[PDB]
Amino acid sequence: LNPMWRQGMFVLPFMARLGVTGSWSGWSITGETGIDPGFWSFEGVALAHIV
Amino acid sequence: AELTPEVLTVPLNSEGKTITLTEKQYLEGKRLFQYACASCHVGGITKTNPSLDLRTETLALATPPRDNIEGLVDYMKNPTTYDGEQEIAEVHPSLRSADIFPKMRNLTEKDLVAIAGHILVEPKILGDKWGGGKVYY
Amino acid sequence: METLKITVYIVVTFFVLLFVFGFLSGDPARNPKRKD
Amino acid sequence: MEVNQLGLIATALFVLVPSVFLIILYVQTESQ
Amino acid sequence: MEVNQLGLIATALFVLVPSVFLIILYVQTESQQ
Amino acid sequence: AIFRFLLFFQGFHNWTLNPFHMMGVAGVLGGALLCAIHGATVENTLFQDGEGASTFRAFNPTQAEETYSMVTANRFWSQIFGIAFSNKRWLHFFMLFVPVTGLWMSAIGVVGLALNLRSYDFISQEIRAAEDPEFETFYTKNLLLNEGIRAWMAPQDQPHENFVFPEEVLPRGNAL
Amino acid sequence: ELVNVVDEKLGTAYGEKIDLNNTNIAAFIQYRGLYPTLAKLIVKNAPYESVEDVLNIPGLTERQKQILRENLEHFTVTEVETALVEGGDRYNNGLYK
Amino acid sequence: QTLTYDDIVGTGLANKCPTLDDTARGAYPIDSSQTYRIARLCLQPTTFLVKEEPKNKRQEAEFVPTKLVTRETTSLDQIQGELKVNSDGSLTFVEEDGIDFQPVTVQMAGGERIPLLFTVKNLVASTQPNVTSITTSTDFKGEFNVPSYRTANFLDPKGRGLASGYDSAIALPQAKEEELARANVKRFSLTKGQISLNVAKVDGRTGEIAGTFESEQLSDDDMGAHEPHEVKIQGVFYASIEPA
Amino acid sequence: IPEKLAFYDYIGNNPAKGGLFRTGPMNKGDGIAQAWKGHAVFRNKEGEELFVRRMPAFFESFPVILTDKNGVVKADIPFRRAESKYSFEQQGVTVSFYGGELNGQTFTDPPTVKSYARKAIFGEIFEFDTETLNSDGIFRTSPRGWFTFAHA
Amino acid sequence: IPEKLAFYDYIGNNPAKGGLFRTGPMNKGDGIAQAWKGHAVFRNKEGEELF
Amino acid sequence: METITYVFIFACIIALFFFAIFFREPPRIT
Amino acid sequence: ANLWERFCNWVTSTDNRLYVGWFGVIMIPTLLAATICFVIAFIAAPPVDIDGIREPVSGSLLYGNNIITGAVVPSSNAIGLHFYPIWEAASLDEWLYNGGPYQLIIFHFLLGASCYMGRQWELSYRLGMRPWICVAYSAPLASAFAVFLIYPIGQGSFSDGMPLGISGTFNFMIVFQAEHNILMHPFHQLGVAGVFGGALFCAMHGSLVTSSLIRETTETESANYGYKFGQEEETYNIVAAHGYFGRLIFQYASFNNSRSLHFFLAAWPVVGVWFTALGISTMAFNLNGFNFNHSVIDAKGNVINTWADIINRANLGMEVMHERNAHNFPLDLA
């Protein structure tokens, strides 16, 4: 009932569209808790663009 | 104010008899208290057991009452717990235990009177401060 | 974590060796007056 | 009136930033 | 956090107004020489 | 007595949180740094003007020539720190400016404290902390320190107020 | 509804006598003969339904009963309060001097 | 063979309950005449599960996994107590004493720290009737007390407490107090927990037993500030029995 | 007693109670005063009249101590409870109001009585609207204060 | 009927219901959706169902 | 918003560092 | 022309915009590591259990801090002086809770700062300079060692080292005053004298030189343009400056030797700061400030309070309140 598109997320769905789904804090946008996304998490993608 | 004979007059025993210390006695008892006792009893408290202090009111409720020269002299020779039930020479400095508390070795009978007298005089001078702890520093 | 530890050990050793061998490579001589 | 709080800053900056840009270009044209 | 909402325009103008004044003065110096 | 004044201003005025005090601190420390760094620089870019190992002798107060190399000093600092002075006049004016400005700033803060116009609190922190007993910052921790100081020092330091605080009212952490 | 139970307990006999079910052990130094031996025994054998229950503590010498008897009038009992008895707080409540 | 202090120290082995060999599948007989005690009971947790909050109607939450952030400080050990024989052949262990609590903080996905007092305080656990032997299928089931994670002297970061501290938000002198009541008035929860010990190994010679445990308790409520979470704990245990 | 006179006898109107970055009108802090609640009179269980020691301007916070006409402490709100002697509960402190909104009312339940005691350290007790300006409860200085600061 | 599916049958999630200067997330308008209240069936006095 | 402001100002100073070092007015002897 | 000799020649090159050098081979990485971890932690680290009591302290902007209150929080008292690199944690989540970043930052920074001092010697040598600027910098550097390493060693824990925060700095110095009465310690007194005097002498020297600049410009231009970079003549008149200052006090209280004067400028603050660094470093071993508590008594034995007793009252209020849930026993021995 509170998906990303209700929350004004614009780039989150572009990361999700191609496979990035989880966060370093351990949640996934699919609702799965406890995933280990690796480096290529939302946070790691952002960091890479900054670098 | 000054160190008059009234302040220097303290109970000798439970029966109510008294004794008037000289100033020399008082000063000598203070020094011997620093030498032998203050490492735990600075200010009239007890660092290793703060529930028991050297205020006259606490000593009066001790068994054998210790609010007097005789009570205190005896305590320094054969200390008991507050209710009198067990002797504690093994963990409290006393003449009985000068083997393991060597500062007590060189203490004469009149030294003990001086120590005892200082303990009884000091709350008359400092009041609440004596045995009150940091709150009164 | 062990991979990370390995990496730091190797990174650190590498830099410490640069430092030691750097200063053993005739450092007194790298000045603008009397080189020896 | 329960207006949008960021409206103030959006308006302020909307004015300030382009105006300052024109003032910079104008003042340095004059001094050459 | 429940901060003063004007703290932001206070901060923005505090940076912006004096900075712009220095920038103006420097650019017109450079195009003198 | 002055030490006591410093401690008063912490417990009562929270003076360390005052941005006018903070600029003063930067001025005093900035001046001390300038002092040590300028003296050191001059002494370590001296021209060899004499044969002796005491370099002091090799100065004449009437000589027209600079006694140290501003150019070597400028290269040194440009390469150690990235920027360096190039103008001896600006350098020395900066040394005047920094500690003088710092002290003027703190004077202003003290004027505010004449009125108890303190930089005591951050309102946003207190609102959250009041509502959220797990929120803790170094800011909240220092105010508890300030509160210890006020209650423990005021009876003796303000005798004319006849403050009597019984033991049970003194704020105290555990055991201590 | 939200009340501080320890404040609330100060408004009971606890606030005026030695409560055998709740009061920290250093309060037994206020009367003679009680500390440490009897005070130890009282605390270990709490709770009590009556102040007179203390005298049925298995093992009292007749001297100890007479000390308790003397002192009954300085004693009270109230319901055990978890906040005062958890944590070992009846032996050390973090107050020293 | 056994280890010295200097062998253990720094290894993490101090936080681990003793194991039994996998050959230890005997049985320990009970003489309803004799009396017994547990001389050492050791609970070592391996897993911490928290129930989530599912927001919508009749979905009911799941137990999700968590990350331990407080390190090897989790085990209960040196617990001792009566092991009783009841009229009906059941055994009841009554906890007398021991190191029967450890504060633990685990973290949930999303960053939320969840602290809890992992405990078996006042544990009374009973077996089935007609035991007469502790075997590799004996189960203990019981319940224990979970006192408040902080005790009454604990002062919050604005100095408010139960047995000590301020009784108001002193930094908001003229604020409305009603909204602050939940945070200004500390209370001291005391809740029950539930545990199952499943014996899987038994050394009939030495009295030692070992198995698996699962317990269920509430987390910290910060002296009434917020609602607790439900917590599930899994691990291994070891006990030593003795004729008393 | 006119409400206006009573409102001067209240520390929230004291210009030395503000802060440098506590901005805006005094109403934004304690709120908009609506009414005098009345004059609070504290008595202990023995019927002695007790007096709240007033907060001096220097103190951001201040304890709650009650004194008799002689200055002898007879009640307080304790920090450490374990060894307290002067709690409102132990001393049976009550509060009665004369004048104002609460004239003729007596409160006996300790937490309500402590509540008014915490306000009496500020002097006379008032009712404030805090919703209208979303007042945060923290004292601000007056124009007397801001003018002096600026001009000095 | 799963909540997810019902939530799609709601005009508040139709992207053609907004406005150019109505800013932010959809949750700043109708709110953060919490639950399906259920499917409402309207009847008249004669028991006939109305839509 | 306050977090963004703080980090923005910090970022601006770091960028200023870069220009003051690498794009300074070069000191030229006389 | 050998590959290693080429690298060595780039390392020590005097033609690099920033000098690298051998000390810099260590300094660049370790300062980069410290700086990057600090920036990220100050912005986004979660709360850290500094005193080991499971009482986490929020220090970062994202968890409700501002610039003044934020800090990278010292590592947990539970760790003491144990080494807590990342690879010793079960997870980064754990390392964050216990204060690992603080250890990473301070150890890299101390190394990098130590190499900073060496780099100052090193370029001085390559440029044909005298060597001792790095000796001046040893005063600040020793001071950082004191509050980040020495004091934690003596007290047994990095949880009592200075926080990397503005308000944490203040917490540190308040609690230092209650546990050590630093104000009454003569080495702190000398540091105040080095720092007040340094500012004084900074102002003096800058105003005296500025007072005696030789007219080289008009009223309508900054006098700064009267000095040109690398001119050989002095730009002020030190004999005019000596003549003013020696009449302001008396003649022999004024320098007429520029070399002595600038040496004095260097010596005074450097040495007062050495002592204050030494002050922190010896209070690390609990040789505390002077104690005049109850030193004055009257003929009866009443205490007569002095301002030292008033200080003590303040110190007590700091002692009894700090780390308010962390002490179970009556003496705060470390």
Ligand SMILES: CCCCCCCCCCCCCCCCCC(=O)OC[C@H](CO[C@@H]1O[C@H](CO[C@H]2O[C@H](CO)[C@H](O)[C@H](O)[C@H]2O)[C@H](O)[C@H](O)[C@H]1O)OC(=O)CCCCCCCCCCCCCCCCC
């Ligand atoms: C200024 C000019 C100077 C010029 C210099 C030129 C510039 C050079 C560019 C440098 C830029 C530096 C950028 C550093 C960013 C740090 C990234 C970080 O720390 O990110 C690290 C991430 C963080 O991981 C996640 O970290 C998370 C941390 O959570 C925390 O963080 C969350 C916020 O994200 C929430 O707050 C959450 O609640 C909180 O707990 C969780 O713990 C996850 O479990 C965990 O996966 O790790 C990972 O997954 C990724 C990597 C780990 C893989 C594990 C294998 C071991 C790794 C070996 C690699 C060593 C490096 C090689 C050296 C090479 C030498 C040739």
Ligand code: CLA
């Ligand atoms: C890093 C630590 C640090 C630093 C550098 C400073 C720096 C400063 N502090 Mg802060 N301070 C700090 C920490 C620090 N403080 C802390 C932790 C506290 C506790 C809250 C305080 C509390 C504090 C207070 C309470 C005050 C300061 C003040 C000051 C300023 C003093 C200015 C000065 O030189 O006065 C020295 C005095 C003068 C310059 C006045 C005139 C002196 C004349 C010329 C004397 C001439 C004497 C003559 C020669 C004869 C003497 C002879 C005799 C000695 C024998 C300065 C900005 C003061 C301030 O801000 O004032 C505006 C102030 O009142 N500070």
Ligand code: CLA
């Ligand atoms: C003598 C000047 C003066 C005085 C005493 C007042 C006093 C007052 N005004 Mg008024 N006002 C004034 C001038 C003045 N005003 C001017 C000139 C304007 C036009 C901008 C206004 C606009 C105005 C408005 C819009 C409002 C007031 C309001 C108020 C009240 C509360 C103000 C407050 O919160 O202050 C807060 C004060 C501060 C936060 C202190 C600022 C300190 C600055 C930041 C220091 C700068 C330091 C500097 C950088 C130093 C470094 C330099 C160095 C490096 C060289 C108070 C009665 C308010 C009110 O209640 O109205 C009904 C309100 O809403 N005033």
Ligand code: CLA
């Ligand atoms: C491809 C462009 C794009 C798109 C589609 C979005 C889309 C979105 N953003 Mg994002 N965003 C973008 C670029 C974009 N963003 C950029 C570049 C930034 C940095 C400034 C942001 C910063 C940002 C933030 C900070 C936030 C969003 C949020 C959102 C959501 C709400 C948008 C809203 O209310 O707009 C409202 C749109 C308007 C009011 C329209 C402005 C157009 C006016 C008419 C100006 C043009 C007039 C022009 C000057 C005329 C000149 C005439 C002259 C030539 C003659 C939405 C999903 C919000 C959200 O929900 O976050 C989760 C939010 O908080 N965005």
Ligand SMILES: CC(C)=CCC/C(C)=C/CC/C(C)=C/CC/C(C)=C/CC/C(C)=C/CC/C(C)=C/CC/C(C)=C/CC/C(C)=C/CC/C(C)=C/CC1=CC(=O)C(C)=C(C)C1=O
């Ligand atoms: C990521 C996030 C957000 C991080 C946040 C981190 C954080 C905590 C940051 C907070 C920052 C913070 C708020 C700082 C507060 C600072 C503050 C109080 C500001 C003070 C402002 C103010 C104006 C104060 C008034 C006093 C004042 C004017 C002080 C100025 C001090 C100052 C700049 C002094 C100089 C310092 C300095 C290093 C000088 C070097 C000079 C120099 C290169 C000398 C070398 C040199 C010497 C020679 O002799 C010669 C011959 C030559 C040639 C030569 O070169």
Ligand SMILES: CC(C)=CCC/C(C)=C/CC/C(C)=C\CC/C(C)=C/CC/C(C)=C/CC/C(C)=C/CC/C(C)=C/CC/C(C)=C\CC/C(C)=C/CC1=CC(=O)C(C)=C(C)C1=O
């Ligand atoms: C009725 C009855 C009974 C009453 C009678 C009472 C009575 C008669 C009273 C009246 C008394 C009377 C009539 C008057 C006479 C009184 C009398 C003469 C009293 C003396 C007054 C007095 C207190 C004076 C104050 C003394 C004072 C504070 C001086 C201190 C000196 C001092 C410590 C100075 C520091 C100097 C120092 C070493 C260096 C300065 C720093 C320095 C590095 C400067 C930089 C610098 C220096 C240079 O040099 C040059 C070149 C340059 C470039 C440069 O950078």
Ligand SMILES: CCCCCCCCCCCCCCCC(=O)OC[C@H](COP(=O)(O)OC[C@@H](O)CO)OC(=O)CCCCCCCCCCCCCCC
């Ligand atoms: C490996 C080494 C890495 C070192 C990196 C350090 C780089 C940072 C140094 C400062 C760069 C910016 C200086 C710009 C300004 C700058 O370009 O000044 C350049 C200026 C040049 O002086 P000149 O004498 O050439 O100029 C005189 C004439 O212009 C007269 O008009 O130098 C001075 O003024 C230096 C003294 C003030 C310098 C104080 C700077 C230190 C302050 C640091 C502030 C930190 C706040 C941090 C908050 C987050």
Ligand code: HEC
């Ligand atoms: C120097 C010779 C002295 C003297 C004259 C006294 N002490 Fe001590 N003291 C210590 C402890 C732990 C206790 C409590 C013992 C117990 O009851 O368990 C005491 C008690 C006393 C008392 C009785 C106080 C009372 O209220 O009855 C007296 C009169 C007394 N002491 C005198 C601890 C220490 C020390 C720690 C090593 C040392 C040293 C001393 N005491 C020294 C002395």
Ligand code: OEX
């Ligand atoms: O940690 Mn920081 O602080 Ca140096 O003492 Mn002990 O410990 Mn804690 O207490 Mn006081």
Ligand SMILES: [Cl-]
């Ligand atoms: Cl603290």
Ligand SMILES: [Cl-]
């Ligand atoms: Cl402790």
Ligand SMILES: [Fe+2]
């Ligand atoms: Fe100079």
